[PDB]
Enzyme design. Sequence first.
Site, PDB file in Angstrom:
ATOM      1  N   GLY A  72      61.477   7.590  21.517  1.00 28.28           N
ATOM      2  CA  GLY A  72      61.969   6.582  22.431  1.00 28.28           C
ATOM      3  C   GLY A  72      62.107   5.226  21.774  1.00 28.28           C
ATOM      4  O   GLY A  72      61.791   5.025  20.601  1.00 28.28           O
ATOM      5  N   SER A 110      56.230   5.006  24.304  1.00 28.10           N
ATOM      6  CA  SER A 110      55.884   4.252  25.502  1.00 28.10           C
ATOM      7  C   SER A 110      55.453   5.197  26.616  1.00 28.10           C
ATOM      8  O   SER A 110      55.847   6.368  26.654  1.00 28.10           O
ATOM      9  CB  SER A 110      57.065   3.408  25.998  1.00 28.10           C
ATOM     10  OG  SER A 110      58.193   4.211  26.325  1.00 28.10           O
ATOM     11  N   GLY A 158      59.102   4.454  29.392  1.00 25.85           N
ATOM     12  CA  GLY A 158      60.423   5.008  29.204  1.00 25.85           C
ATOM     13  C   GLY A 158      60.504   6.457  29.645  1.00 25.85           C
ATOM     14  O   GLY A 158      59.504   7.174  29.728  1.00 25.85           O
ATOM     15  N   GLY A 159      61.731   6.885  29.954  1.00 33.75           N
ATOM     16  CA  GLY A 159      61.949   8.270  30.333  1.00 33.75           C
ATOM     17  C   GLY A 159      61.870   9.219  29.155  1.00 33.75           C
ATOM     18  O   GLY A 159      61.455  10.374  29.310  1.00 33.75           O
ATOM     19  N   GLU A 213      57.762   2.761  36.107  1.00 32.33           N
ATOM     20  CA  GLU A 213      56.911   3.112  34.975  1.00 32.33           C
ATOM     21  C   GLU A 213      55.549   3.666  35.378  1.00 32.33           C
ATOM     22  O   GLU A 213      55.032   4.526  34.643  1.00 32.33           O
ATOM     23  CB  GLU A 213      56.741   1.900  34.059  1.00 32.33           C
ATOM     24  CG  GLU A 213      58.031   1.475  33.408  1.00 32.33           C
ATOM     25  CD  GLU A 213      57.835   0.287  32.507  1.00 32.33           C
ATOM     26  OE1 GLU A 213      57.561   0.494  31.306  1.00 32.33           O
ATOM     27  OE2 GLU A 213      57.935  -0.853  33.006  1.00 32.33           O
ATOM     28  N   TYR A 256      60.043  -8.254  21.503  1.00 35.36           N
ATOM     29  CA  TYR A 256      59.532  -6.992  20.984  1.00 35.36           C
ATOM     30  C   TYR A 256      59.188  -7.121  19.505  1.00 35.36           C
ATOM     31  O   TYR A 256      58.185  -6.566  19.041  1.00 35.36           O
ATOM     32  CB  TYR A 256      60.557  -5.880  21.213  1.00 35.36           C
ATOM     33  CG  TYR A 256      60.602  -5.378  22.641  1.00 35.36           C
ATOM     34  CD1 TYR A 256      59.434  -5.185  23.371  1.00 35.36           C
ATOM     35  CD2 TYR A 256      61.813  -5.107  23.263  1.00 35.36           C
ATOM     36  CE1 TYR A 256      59.470  -4.736  24.672  1.00 35.36           C
ATOM     37  CE2 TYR A 256      61.858  -4.656  24.568  1.00 35.36           C
ATOM     38  CZ  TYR A 256      60.683  -4.472  25.264  1.00 35.36           C
ATOM     39  OH  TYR A 256      60.722  -4.029  26.557  1.00 35.36           O
ATOM     40  N   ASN A 311      55.709  -6.069  18.066  1.00 38.18           N
ATOM     41  CA  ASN A 311      55.616  -4.877  17.227  1.00 38.18           C
ATOM     42  C   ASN A 311      54.936  -5.178  15.898  1.00 38.18           C
ATOM     43  O   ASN A 311      54.216  -4.333  15.354  1.00 38.18           O
ATOM     44  CB  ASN A 311      57.012  -4.299  17.004  1.00 38.18           C
ATOM     45  CG  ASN A 311      57.565  -3.631  18.249  1.00 38.18           C
ATOM     46  OD1 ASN A 311      56.859  -3.484  19.252  1.00 38.18           O
ATOM     47  ND2 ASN A 311      58.825  -3.223  18.194  1.00 38.18           N
ATOM     48  N   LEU A 368      42.350  13.335  10.222  1.00 37.29           N
ATOM     49  CA  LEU A 368      42.530  13.177  11.662  1.00 37.29           C
ATOM     50  C   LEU A 368      41.364  13.763  12.447  1.00 37.29           C
ATOM     51  O   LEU A 368      40.965  13.216  13.482  1.00 37.29           O
ATOM     52  CB  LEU A 368      43.838  13.839  12.098  1.00 37.29           C
ATOM     53  CG  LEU A 368      45.141  13.295  11.522  1.00 37.29           C
ATOM     54  CD1 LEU A 368      46.313  14.097  12.085  1.00 37.29           C
ATOM     55  CD2 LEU A 368      45.310  11.823  11.824  1.00 37.29           C
ATOM     56  N   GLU A 382      38.319  13.657  11.793  1.00 37.64           N
ATOM     57  CA  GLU A 382      37.207  12.719  11.832  1.00 37.64           C
ATOM     58  C   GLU A 382      37.403  11.643  12.895  1.00 37.64           C
ATOM     59  O   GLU A 382      36.412  11.077  13.370  1.00 37.64           O
ATOM     60  CB  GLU A 382      37.014  12.093  10.451  1.00 37.64           C
ATOM     61  CG  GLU A 382      35.727  11.305  10.305  1.00 37.64           C
ATOM     62  CD  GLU A 382      35.362  11.038   8.855  1.00 37.64           C
ATOM     63  OE1 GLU A 382      34.557  10.115   8.609  1.00 37.64           O
ATOM     64  OE2 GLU A 382      35.879  11.750   7.965  1.00 37.64           O
TER      65      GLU A 382
HETATM   66  N1  LIG Z   1      55.538  -3.010  22.493  1.00 38.27           N
HETATM   67  C1  LIG Z   1      56.790  -2.608  22.699  1.00 38.27           C
HETATM   68  N2  LIG Z   1      57.151  -2.101  23.931  1.00 38.27           N
HETATM   69  C2  LIG Z   1      58.421  -1.688  24.156  1.00 38.27           C
HETATM   70  C3  LIG Z   1      59.373  -1.769  23.152  1.00 38.27           C
HETATM   71  N3  LIG Z   1      60.536  -1.294  23.649  1.00 38.27           N
HETATM   72  C4  LIG Z   1      60.346  -0.916  24.933  1.00 38.27           C
HETATM   73  N4  LIG Z   1      59.045  -1.170  25.263  1.00 38.27           N
HETATM   74  C5  LIG Z   1      58.393  -0.905  26.553  1.00 38.27           C
HETATM   75  O1  LIG Z   1      58.704   0.425  26.962  1.00 38.27           O
HETATM   76  C6  LIG Z   1      58.998   0.500  28.356  1.00 38.27           C
HETATM   77  C7  LIG Z   1      60.363   1.142  28.574  1.00 38.27           C
HETATM   78  O2  LIG Z   1      60.423   2.394  27.925  1.00 38.27           O
HETATM   79  P1  LIG Z   1      61.337   2.624  26.618  1.00 38.27           P
HETATM   80  O3  LIG Z   1      60.510   3.097  25.447  1.00 38.27           O
HETATM   81  O4  LIG Z   1      62.078   1.353  26.278  1.00 38.27           O
HETATM   82  O5  LIG Z   1      62.408   3.739  27.074  1.00 38.27           O
HETATM   83  P2  LIG Z   1      62.667   5.064  26.195  1.00 38.27           P
HETATM   84  O6  LIG Z   1      61.402   5.524  25.511  1.00 38.27           O
HETATM   85  O7  LIG Z   1      63.767   4.806  25.194  1.00 38.27           O
HETATM   86  O8  LIG Z   1      63.152   6.158  27.272  1.00 38.27           O
HETATM   87  P3  LIG Z   1      64.530   5.942  28.077  1.00 38.27           P
HETATM   88  O9  LIG Z   1      64.239   5.710  29.540  1.00 38.27           O
HETATM   89  O10 LIG Z   1      65.375   7.183  27.916  1.00 38.27           O
HETATM   90  O11 LIG Z   1      65.267   4.752  27.509  1.00 38.27           O
HETATM   91  C8  LIG Z   1      58.886  -0.921  28.914  1.00 38.27           C
HETATM   92  O12 LIG Z   1      57.704  -0.983  29.676  1.00 38.27           O
HETATM   93  C9  LIG Z   1      58.845  -1.826  27.689  1.00 38.27           C
HETATM   94  O13 LIG Z   1      57.983  -2.916  27.877  1.00 38.27           O
HETATM   95  C10 LIG Z   1      59.019  -2.275  21.908  1.00 38.27           C
HETATM   96  O14 LIG Z   1      59.856  -2.352  21.010  1.00 38.27           O
HETATM   97  N5  LIG Z   1      57.723  -2.696  21.687  1.00 38.27           N
END
Ligand SMILES: Nc1nc2c(ncn2[C@@H]2O[C@H](COP(=O)(O)OP(=O)(O)OP(=O)(O)O)[C@@H](O)[C@H]2O)c(=O)[nH]1
Lengths: 438, 350, 62, 426
Positions: free
Chosen positions: A10, A140, A143-144, A183, A224, A228, A252, A254
Amino acid sequence: MRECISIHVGQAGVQIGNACWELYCLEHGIQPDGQMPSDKTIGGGDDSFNTFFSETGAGKHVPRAVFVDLEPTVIDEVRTGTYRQLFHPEQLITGKEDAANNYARGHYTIGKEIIDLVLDRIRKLADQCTGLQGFLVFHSFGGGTGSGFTSLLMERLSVDYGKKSKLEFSIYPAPQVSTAVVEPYNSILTTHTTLEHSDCAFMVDNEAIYDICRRNLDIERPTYTNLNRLISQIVSSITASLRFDGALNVDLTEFQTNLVPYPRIHFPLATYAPVISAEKAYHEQLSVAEITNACFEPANQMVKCDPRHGKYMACCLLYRGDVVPKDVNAAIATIKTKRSIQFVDWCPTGFKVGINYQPPTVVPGGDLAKVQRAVCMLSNTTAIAEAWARLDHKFDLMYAKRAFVHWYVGEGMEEGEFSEAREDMAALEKDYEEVGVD
Amino acid sequence: MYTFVVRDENSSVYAEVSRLLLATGQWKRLRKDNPRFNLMLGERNRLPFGRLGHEPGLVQLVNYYRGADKLCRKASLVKLIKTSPELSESCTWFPESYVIYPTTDEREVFLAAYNRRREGREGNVWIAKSSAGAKGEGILISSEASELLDFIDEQGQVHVIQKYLEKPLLLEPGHRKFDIRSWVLVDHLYNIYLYREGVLRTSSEPYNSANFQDKTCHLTNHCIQKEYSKNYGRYEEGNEMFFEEFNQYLMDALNTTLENSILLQIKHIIRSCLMCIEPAISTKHLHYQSFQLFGFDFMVDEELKVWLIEVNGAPACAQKLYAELCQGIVDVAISSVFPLATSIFIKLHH
Amino acid sequence: MEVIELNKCTSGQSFEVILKPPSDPSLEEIQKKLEAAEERRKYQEAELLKHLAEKREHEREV
Amino acid sequence: MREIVHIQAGQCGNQIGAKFWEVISDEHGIDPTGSYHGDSDLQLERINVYYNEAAGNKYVPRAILVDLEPGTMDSVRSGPFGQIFRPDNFVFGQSGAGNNWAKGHYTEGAELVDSVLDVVRKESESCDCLQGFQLTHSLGGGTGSGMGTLLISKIREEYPDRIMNTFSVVPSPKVSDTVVEPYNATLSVHQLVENTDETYCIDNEALYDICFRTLKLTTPTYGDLNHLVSATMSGVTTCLRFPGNADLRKLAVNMVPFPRLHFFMPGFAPLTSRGQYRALTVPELTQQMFDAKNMMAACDPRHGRYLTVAAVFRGRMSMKEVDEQMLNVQNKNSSYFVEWIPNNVKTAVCDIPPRGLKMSATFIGNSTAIQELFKRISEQFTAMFRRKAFLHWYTGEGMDEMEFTEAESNMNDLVSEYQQYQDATA
Ligand SMILES: Nc1nc2c(ncn2[C@@H]2O[C@H](COP(=O)(O)OP(=O)(O)OP(=O)(O)O)[C@@H](O)[C@H]2O)c(=O)[nH]1
Ligand SMILES: Nc1ncnc2c1ncn2[C@@H]1O[C@H](COP(=O)(O)OP(=O)(O)CP(=O)(O)O)[C@@H](O)[C@H]1O
Ligand SMILES: COc1cc(OC)c(-c2coc3c4c(ccc3c2=O)OC(C)(C)C=C4)cc1OC
Ligand SMILES: Nc1nc2c(ncn2[C@@H]2O[C@H](COP(=O)(O)OP(=O)(O)O)[C@@H](O)[C@H]2O)c(=O)[nH]1
Ligand SMILES: [Ca+2]
Ligand SMILES: [Ca+2]
Ligand SMILES: [Ca+2]
Ligand SMILES: [Ca+2]
Ligand SMILES: [Mg+2]
Ligand SMILES: [Mg+2]
Ligand SMILES: [Mg+2]
């Protein structure tokens, strides 16, 4: 030497992975080229850095990494970036339309169509491994893809690599840098399905990182990128023992042995210090005692919560820089007499300590100042259950109304999974409480 | 403007604090489950501390200290005093007490002292209490031990047995017993504010060391006097003597003041207890802040020594002082954090 | 405070400090979950298309 | 590449559609011949969401123009950006629909719908990853309303897993062409309830009140109403047209908690008349955007509760000040947000402003107060329908009273479903 394969799933997973692999290359002296002048065993080796990098006959050092996203825009930046030469096309895997922040869509609908391919590109790296250890999975909760596809991947990795350990780095959702509403649904759905498949998971709450960036880096509106690079520092300090000479957390297995006495309660809290703005003109370097004491302030934790009102099952201290055992033990003695540090009765009250003399590497032009010594504390404290309580309450509020549920049902899921997953979480919250409270 | 939520229906004190804040014109009340509140007047049981301080851009404040129960529950207060070096095994102002389980137990040390008292021919009556004994129930003053040890096991709550203060100070006229209630407010900076107005909670009946099983002679709570006792209300309204009368009495009758005789060591005890737990409950560096109002209960023996007997975590006030004290909470505990557009508290410095 | 298992190397050292002692689903089964959900989509999609076909028939009758 | 296919149907649909293409073309630097002459490459990273690339560095709108009458489409081809459009994407009859939903949906429009779908297919086939469709149309006429909703039903049948969203102009007696609009609108609304993912409800009654009371235009024209529509359309699509990671489906997922309740209240700040030296302040953008006066659906947000809210700020400004002011406005309006959807207010900032304003903000509110709009339409519908007034125009095209009775009932169920969630608590 035993190899580790890193899997980034993701948006959040991919972009954190790039920050991490960037930092790894700077730490091991690998250039964007993929060339490592200091590796004098050309085209091979079983050194500690070979746990994360393979080697080509041309002396290119290639991350043992798979990047997976269900739409391509994020991984395209990998393919064009500063480390574009590092990876090879078959390590980057992009679908065509994403999961739309819908767990069901990442798990069932789109996931079914790309799972077999992903496990094939992973098999190709596992075939380059004499002694594969297992997997580090970045994603995350919100994200989906990160929620939905990750839980499917984790299920199948337990089938195809059943003896292998699997660690997660998981981004817990924070409204302050998220534009999504569902979320909490995705978080509880992916945690339920992944729990029996993950040996140890390090949650990072974007709320905590965001505040650290604002308070200690003087960044008024963190991006981000800001987040990151800080996350990558913490991740690096956690994985440094897999990539450098040492005797603590060297495989791992451990990690689970030292941090997870109960398999279900496998979410150690990370605390990191010091975080110092690089724009600070004058800064007085912090001592072993000061950075160690900072490991018990909630303001430096990857998840905001109060360990005083909970109990510890394990605690590791991971120092980088100018540190020797005497100063650590002098700091621990003083800290114990002034902090509420309660272990559960059936665990020894104490700390496993690792020191690595190289100070933290910082990205040039980043936000973090170089420091002479830094520490990351990994404590399995029941107080992290506060994060489960917060997220389950948001879930309850929406699901009592079935708000947004039709999106998941529409992709093939049944309401029963919602309540099944939430019951697991209810048990987890109870598991934490009978461990941590009297 | 500021928002707040109300989640203890039955709190005399914060009921009046609710009213005060509304009547300022700068506080809006929300409903129980709305989370974009600035201030939470929380429940007494299982307040969700874990959910506070995570609302972006909202400074949040609650009227309870997480962890303050260690002090405000009778079994755990005993454990805190005996195990905290700050207080120690023979702290001078807390009665020798023992936590005893029915059916970390001290049933044997309880008897070791009790026995050496038997042979010493010295005072050896005890009292045994619980945190579940509401409105005067579940307590037993007995000169013979196992008469109370059997009273303990006949129910399922954990009890404390403490040496009953045999030689209490007795007011006159009345040859009557009392305890002192002090109200203490601890703000988000952990300033310790003692309300200048205390109150004595009196016995209408004369004290009588002979028969312990008769109780309104021995038990000073406001209700038990209100209901069980024949002489309820002669000398002062509601068996409530306030500090001005009690002070004027201590001068007339004992040639001393309330301040020198009792309050100095009340202030000492309050600071000792609260400074001891500060590291465990302080919110100074936390993502939400806490304040709390405590009710300290003291006994005075006939040598003008003060003893601590309980700390109450959800106390009520005297009718006479609600306005004053509740307005003091607003000014010190709440507007200190959420400012609007002399003092009644004694700051105990530390 | 007891120190134990001190190991040292040129890159660093590690040790433990003790302050007090103490007092599987099958591949087939996944594939079935993934396929039952796919079927639920196909059934929902078929009802929608049946609904739209009823609408087309009404359009013809008008 | 997540392309959108745009369809504009009828007089209102094509007039507001053409303004939209004029406005965003200028924003992306495309000139009336389809040649790019911009000064930033932010302009071209997402150019393909709405434009096709043709050899010769030409950009051609992914737009299909439909009407049963040729008049209003001759004027499009005339108009400022008329040459931009792909000539085979003009799909036109001759009969006209006579402000008659039955003609657009069942008789005159049925004749023409297959031709329209051929052009939709031929635009979709050329899409790397089709994101969905948007339709511009009114609900009070016959073509955009009746044939527009027929197109949506056909499009769903052929693309059932694709997002279908609409900009739908609601009739008002204050700006009124015929007495039968409530009939046409009520029939259309039921279609939209079933077959769109997001319907932006552009209420001509609100556009009139805005022009008449705040802009002090004493005789508002369609041109004055559409100046507001175009500003809003540029606004809501800003984050699809410039970098910032949500396709139409992802926006629908986070805005629509119940499938039928997908009718959004638009709003915009600053409200302007055609022909602004003082930039507004972030505090001013925020409070105007939440005030009833800027609401382009004549509904009182204080009479209901927000299920979800989205806001897009445009211009170089402080995201810190945006976050602060947004979190502010939610506390003086805190009762008007449902408490059982946590964090239901979301915001974006884009540093490219619209032409002629350095600060602006667009509002997207999914409020249960929208039910006031459907009640208003339903009351006008019933006033005539209880006497079967003007129905002969519809029975003459094969329709039956029963289809009107069902449309009425379906409409009142929608109003009751909104009232359910306006009283729901946590
Ligand atoms: N720390 C951090 N959080 C992120 C970043 N990008 C997205 N997020 C978090 O991830 C969440 C959204 O999920 P995403 O990872 O962006 O979506 P995805 O994994 O691509 O899945 P999709 O829904 O298909 O887009 C939000 O709550 C964001 O705050 C990142 O680069 N760094
Ligand atoms: N050690 C002791 N010696 C003499 N009397 C004692 C005593 N311990 C308790 N008492 C008496 O018993 C009474 C009740 O004790 P305690 O104060 O614990 O009850 P309680 O907790 O219900 C008071 P509150 O209702 O304010 O919380 C006191 O008012 C006091 O007079
Ligand atoms: C058919 O017409 C459409 C109407 C729309 O809104 C009225 C939208 C529409 C745009 O931006 C959004 C945003 C949003 C949430 C929803 C939307 C949304 O839904 O949240 C943030 C993250 C703050 C950004 C903007 C799209 C359409 O498809 C073309
Ligand atoms: N905002 C706006 N509304 C319009 C315009 N043209 C017509 N309408 C309204 O839409 C309704 C009829 O739709 P119209 O487009 O005229 O007929 P159609 O061609 O069948 O859609 C009437 O009630 C008008 O008030 C326009 O240019 N702008
Ligand atoms: Ca080598
Ligand atoms: Ca396993
Ligand atoms: Ca014809
Ligand atoms: Ca055909
Ligand atoms: Mg994504
Ligand atoms: Mg009590
Ligand atoms: Mg017309």
